[PDB]
UniProtKB/TrEMBL annotation, chain A:
<dbReference type="GO" id="GO:0039654">
    <property type="term" value="P:fusion of virus membrane with host endosome membrane"/>
</dbReference>
<feature type="glycosylation site" description="N-linked (GlcNAc...) asparagine">
    <location>
        <position position="223"/>
    </location>
</feature>
<feature type="glycosylation site" description="N-linked (GlcNAc...) asparagine">
    <location>
        <position position="107"/>
    </location>
</feature>
<dbReference type="GO" id="GO:1903908">
    <property type="term" value="P:positive regulation of plasma membrane raft polarization"/>
</dbReference>
<keyword id="KW-1168">Fusion of virus membrane with host membrane</keyword>
<dbReference type="GO" id="GO:0020002">
    <property type="term" value="C:host cell plasma membrane"/>
</dbReference>
<dbReference type="GO" id="GO:0052031">
    <property type="term" value="P:symbiont-mediated perturbation of host defense response"/>
</dbReference>
<dbReference type="GO" id="GO:0019031">
    <property type="term" value="C:viral envelope"/>
</dbReference>
<feature type="disulfide bond">
    <location>
        <begin position="344"/>
        <end position="374"/>
    </location>
</feature>
<comment type="similarity">
    <text>Belongs to the HIV-1 env protein family.</text>
</comment>
<keyword id="KW-1160">Virus entry into host cell</keyword>
<feature type="glycosylation site" description="N-linked (GlcNAc...) asparagine">
    <location>
        <position position="321"/>
    </location>
</feature>
<keyword id="KW-1039">Host endosome</keyword>
<dbReference type="GO" id="GO:0075512">
    <property type="term" value="P:clathrin-dependent endocytosis of virus by host cell"/>
</dbReference>
<comment type="subunit">
    <text>The mature envelope protein (Env) consists of a homotrimer of non-covalently associated gp120-gp41 heterodimers. The resulting complex protrudes from the virus surface as a spike. There seems to be as few as 10 spikes on the average virion. Surface protein gp120 interacts with host CD4, CCR5 and CXCR4. Gp120 also interacts with the C-type lectins CD209/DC-SIGN and CLEC4M/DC-SIGNR (collectively referred to as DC-SIGN(R)). Gp120 and gp41 interact with GalCer.</text>
</comment>
<feature type="glycosylation site" description="N-linked (GlcNAc...) asparagine">
    <location>
        <position position="57"/>
    </location>
</feature>
<keyword id="KW-0472">Membrane</keyword>
Length: 461, 122, 122, 122, 51
């Protein structure tokens, strides 16, 4: 059959391929000022239209871990923040010897903040005057081996210099939509019982991703999205115990924090035409920062995780164990709330041992029961080798942080004496793993409109 | 029909209404240098594909009838089976070897055939 | 005739010598990134317009006779007076409602008509 | 045949296989803002050249037959001599004067010639 | 008088101030029109216009 080959334009064929994506944010942010919030400045106004559409007969493979779209997210957001800390004051005169009081409180039932003083460059560069400021303890270190106990150092000048964050920018995460150029398309996986790899038996073309909240975290996944029907647990390979297992949660668990201290801001003029802000006297009494969770709901949620970790290691029972320890930045749950940065020692949430059976919440002994302590830092080395410093200025008043837990980051721990109660831990990790928990549904493809098939036309000269 | 209302669909359905997948090469707006890098868009993709599609004599973003002969050594699945049953999204994966030969055959035949226009009106 | 030597002129004068207004889509020189965004210029506008004009079967930057039936419910001013008396800069403002329907009618007619071509030499 | 496999060659050889020289308007990748200016590429050159080539009725990147009369006062070297012996790289140097007049003649003839189709179809 | 509100920068001597004319000018696809009626009250129709 002497058929003549033809060519078609507009063919539906996919090729998984790499590309950049546009960061886009909701409309209401764009009447505001520059960098307020940052999503109004470096990201485009968005549009939910058109509606996501199902591809009726398809079968497409997804690989959550091998995806690199999250890496484009990571690089873009870091470059975004780096540009945000150019137009602010680079501190500098405050890396001096700080004379600090040494009275001590010594009586317990209290944990306090240290009072310090320093000499400053006013509107005359050939004059210095006296100032004082309250500094949270981690930000200040002893000065020298020469044991003058009153002479203390700001933690900088050992590794880097620092920049104050301008008050005109705030940290509340505006939602972002990582969005495709024309000629590319975003495909969304619609299987809820999805193990993270293999074929998604239901797939849809989507204009671009639903709102991502880039909420900073290190030990737990705050405000976000929850599972359709139950807990789903994901990891690349349980053979290597060193990899980070991600657990999603179906029902939310609620967390609320508070800084009951009433800090007051003190304005200091540091160099020509630029100001530094510190903490003045604390109004009222001194109290401890804390976060609360309801313990029957936490226990139930943890047991529901337990019946999903037992699935892969049936002969071995479950034990949740305290964090790794060592560095504070690893062995603590840290996050951002109200512009301040909390650092929680969280051994209290993750002590127990689960045994497959269901130890129930009912009957409730006390419905008002809860499980409840965190430190605060201003000098933040927020990513390694990024221009690490950010000096978070104090905020006035007090704050609360009512929020939802939607997943855990864990370490599966190696064996010991072949014990039936082989254990699990909370696990700090990269911020890429934080955002990999929320873009699993998506992949990127490149459309190929030109293809060839046999028609039955003949041709004319 | 949407941007991909025929992915995994049959030849008959997917070859009618080709336009819906051809129009959407128009988007993009400002975000720094990398965006304007990211605007290859139609600006390169469409120009490339249209240059190929015109060099072969098919100046049209739709079905076009070329003349190069389909061959025994490239097909090997029954002719009548393909146009009723299969999808593009499994046909391109079976034909993917012989793209480069066809992409030269289609243009050398065009140069061969437009030459006879010079004689047939001289 | 200049860049706009027919604005407010009658149909006959403005429909002949359309080229003078079609060619002025080439310009631009460096004033940084904000200017280089300004080079969407012809690079996007001309390609959008030509994509539309080719999807309707009219691969030509001039008068092209499509077949879609003009209707009683879109015209309502007498036929003969339009082509002698009136200018584009008021015709567009009479007709501006029904652009989108027409823009789909012309392409579905093309997809219809090239299909019969596919059979008429098969 | 390579990017310039006919430079200084006879007209017959250089007028066949024009495609090899037409296709090589696709390259270029990132080096800063100056490179992003440097990629005018097809994106301006090809759009310009194809706009001229289509405004003259020749929507094809190959030999096209226009109608404008070659003249005694532009040629002055024997007709049979040129096509067999000479090369483009010395023909353009003799015809370089009358480009601008031909570039308007070719388009006004095209506008003149599409009109007779418009009214005949009417 | 500085240092009460901001810092300051000396103007380089290699740049001088006297205003050179500028022609704010259109891209292709856009066009600039000019209103040729001198008795024009800032609004309303320009009954003579030029491209
Ligand atoms: C962190 O440490 C810094 C120091 O390093 C603390 O800052 C010091 O705070 C004190 C208290 O405010 C301040 O001393 C007062 O300054 C006032 C300025 O107006 C003075 O008027 C006042 O004088 C009275 O108190 C003295 C005792 O402190 C008396 O000896 C003196 O005679 C005055 O008393 C007479 O006048 C009052 C007027 O109200 C009258 O009622 C009395 O009857 C009497 O007739 C104080 O000297 C220091 O100046 C501050 N130091 C600096 C460097 O600024 C800071 O408070 C610490 N932070 C915290 C949270 O505690
Ligand atoms: C800063 O701290 C103060 C005091 O610690 C907070 O004020 C208190 O806020 C709570 C709400 O969070 C108020 O509770 C109210 O209780 C009544 C009880 O009948 C109830 O009807 C309301 O629904 C509400 O829950 C409380 O009245 C209020 N004041 C005190 C003295 O407790 C303040 O909210 C904190 N601000 C921030 C930004 O953290």
């Amino acid at each position: 059959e002497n058929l003549w080959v033809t060519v078609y334009y507009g063919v539906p064929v996919w090729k998984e391929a790499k590309t950049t994506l546009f960061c886009a944010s909701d409309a209401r942010a764009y009447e505001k000022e520059v960098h307020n919030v940052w999503a109004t400045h470096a990201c485009v106004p968005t549009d939910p239209s058109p509606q996501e559409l199902v591809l009726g007969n398809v079968t497409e493979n997804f690989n959550m871990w091998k995806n690199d779209m999250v890496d484009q997210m990571h690089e873009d957001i870091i470059s975004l923040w780096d540009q945000s800390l150019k137009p602010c004051v680079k501190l500098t005169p405050l890396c001096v010897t700080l004379i600090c009081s040494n009275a001590t409180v010594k009586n317990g039932t209290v944990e306090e903040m240290k009072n310090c003083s320093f000499n400053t460059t006013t509107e005359i560069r050939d004059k210095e005057k006296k100032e004082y400021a309250l500094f949270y303890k981690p930000d200040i270190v002893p000065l020298s081996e020469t044991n003058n106990t009153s002479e203390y150092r700001l933690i900088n000048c050992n590794t880097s210099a620092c920049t104050q964050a301008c008050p005109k920018v705030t940290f509340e995460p505006i939602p972002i939509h990582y969005c495709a150029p024309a000629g590319y398309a975003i495909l969304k996986c619609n299987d809820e019982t999805f193990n993270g790899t293999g074929p998604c038996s239901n797939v849809s073309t989507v204009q671009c991703t639903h709102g991502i909240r880039p909420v900073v975290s290190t030990q737990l996944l705050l405000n976000g999205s929850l599972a359709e029907k139950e807990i789903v647990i994901r990891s690349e390979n349980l053979t290597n115990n060193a990899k980070i297992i991600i657990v999603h949660l179906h029902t939310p668990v609620e967390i609320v924090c508070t800084r009951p201290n009433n800090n007051t801001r003190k304005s200091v003029r540091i160099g020509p035409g630029q100001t530094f802000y510190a903490t003045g006297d604390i109004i009222g009494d001194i109290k401890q920062a804390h976060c609360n969770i309801s313990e029957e709901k936490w226990n139930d949620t943890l047991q529901k995780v337990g019946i999903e970790l037992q699935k892969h290691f049936p002969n071995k029972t479950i034990k949740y164990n305290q964090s790794a320890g060592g560095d504070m930045e690893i062995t603590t749950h840290s996050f951002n709330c109200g512009g301040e940065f909390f650092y929680c020692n969280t051994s209290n949430l993750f002590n127990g041992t689960y045994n497959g059976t269901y130890i129930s919440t009912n009957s409730s002994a006390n419905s008002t029961s809860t499980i409840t302590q965190c430190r605060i830092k201003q000098i933040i080395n927020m990513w390694q080798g990024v221009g690490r410093c950010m000096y978070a200025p104090p905020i006035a008043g007090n704050i609360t942080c009512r929020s939802n837990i939607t997943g855990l980051l864990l370490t599966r721990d190696g064996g010991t004496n072949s014990n039936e109660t082989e254990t699990f831990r909370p696990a700090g990790g990269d911020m890429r793993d934080n955002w990999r928990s929320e873009l699993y549904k998506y992949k990127v493809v490149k459309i190929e409109p030109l293809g060839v098939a046999p028609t039955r036309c003949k041709r004319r000269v | 029909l949407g941007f991909l209302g025929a992915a995994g669909s049959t030849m008959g359905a997917a070859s009618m209404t080709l336009t819906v997948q051809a129009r959407n090469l128009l988007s993009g707006t400002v975000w720094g240098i990398k965006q304007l890098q990211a605007r290859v868009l139609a600006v390169e993709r469409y120009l490339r594909d249209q240059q190929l599609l015109g060099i072969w004599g098919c100046s049209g973003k739709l079905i076009c009838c070329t003349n190069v002969p389909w061959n025994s050594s490239w097909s090997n699945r029954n002719l009548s089976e393909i146009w009723d049953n299969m999808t593009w999204l499994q046909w391109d994966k079976e034909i993917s070897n012989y793209t480069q030969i066809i992409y030269g055959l289609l243009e050398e035949s065009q140069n061969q055939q437009e030459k006879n226009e010079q004689d047939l009106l001289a």
